[PDB]
Design a binder for these strands. Structure first.
Length: 43
DNA sequence: GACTAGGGAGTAATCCCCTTGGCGGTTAAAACGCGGGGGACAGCGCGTACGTGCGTTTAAGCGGTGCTAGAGCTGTCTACGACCAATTGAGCGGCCTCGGCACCGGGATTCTCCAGGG
């Protein structure tokens, strides 16, 4: 249950950043560059 | 044309305020030490909550398919942004307050310890 909580607290952000990338991409399809760009900001 | 008179600069003396070192006096913070006690931790017991073996199924990968709506590039124009300065006012550079902040006292209030009995 705890690891379920931590994944719910991690993946929602690592897909919300991709959502913002799609918003600032005029693009309905997630691509590798956009998702990796939104992802690497974690560290 | 020859020499005369006066004042700010050239030379110089006065003042004098400004600091370099060392040394002594004195308060505050840091430095050191003890009695004792509360925090750290061993020894241990256990139970119950997982560590593990095996039966019996749903499900991701498998193997393939038929396309379908969103993504990349091809012109093309045109609304707009980076190119001089006048401006003139939005705002900063320097000064002068009295007020909120600084901070401590008298007191009410509150937080804590004990040796006993209750």
């Amino acid at each position: 249950e705890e690891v379920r909580a931590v994944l719910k607290s991690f993946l929602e952000s690592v897909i919300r950043d991709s959502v913002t990338y799609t918003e600032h991409a005029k693009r309905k399809t997630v691509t590798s560059l956009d998702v990796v760009y939104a992802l690497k900001r974690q560290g």
